[PDB]
Amino acid sequence: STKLYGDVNDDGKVNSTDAVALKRYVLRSGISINTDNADLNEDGRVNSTDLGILKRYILKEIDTLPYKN
Ligand SMILES: [Ca+2]
Ligand SMILES: [Ca+2]
Numbered sequence: 001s002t003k004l005y006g007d008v009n010d011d012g013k014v015n016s017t018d019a020v021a022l023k024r025y026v027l028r029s030g031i032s033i034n035t036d037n038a039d040l041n042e043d044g045r046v047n048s049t050d051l052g053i054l055k056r057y058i059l060k061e062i063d064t065l066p067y068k069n
Helices: 016-026 048-058
Strands: none
Touching (some): 016 048
């Protein structure tokens, strides 16, 4: 796979699983994911912002990536 903005599971594609997966990390549950891919805005850290962006991306809310926050 490749560094895809949204691919947290590191599978090479943005699937619904990537959304729920990111939600687990943001909650600080202790889930290992690809923070590099999670960062959709390139803020430097995976925060609630990235989560919303990832979800919105799959919800046909945003097509232009990466985001500039
Ligand atoms: Ca994926
Ligand atoms: Ca981020």
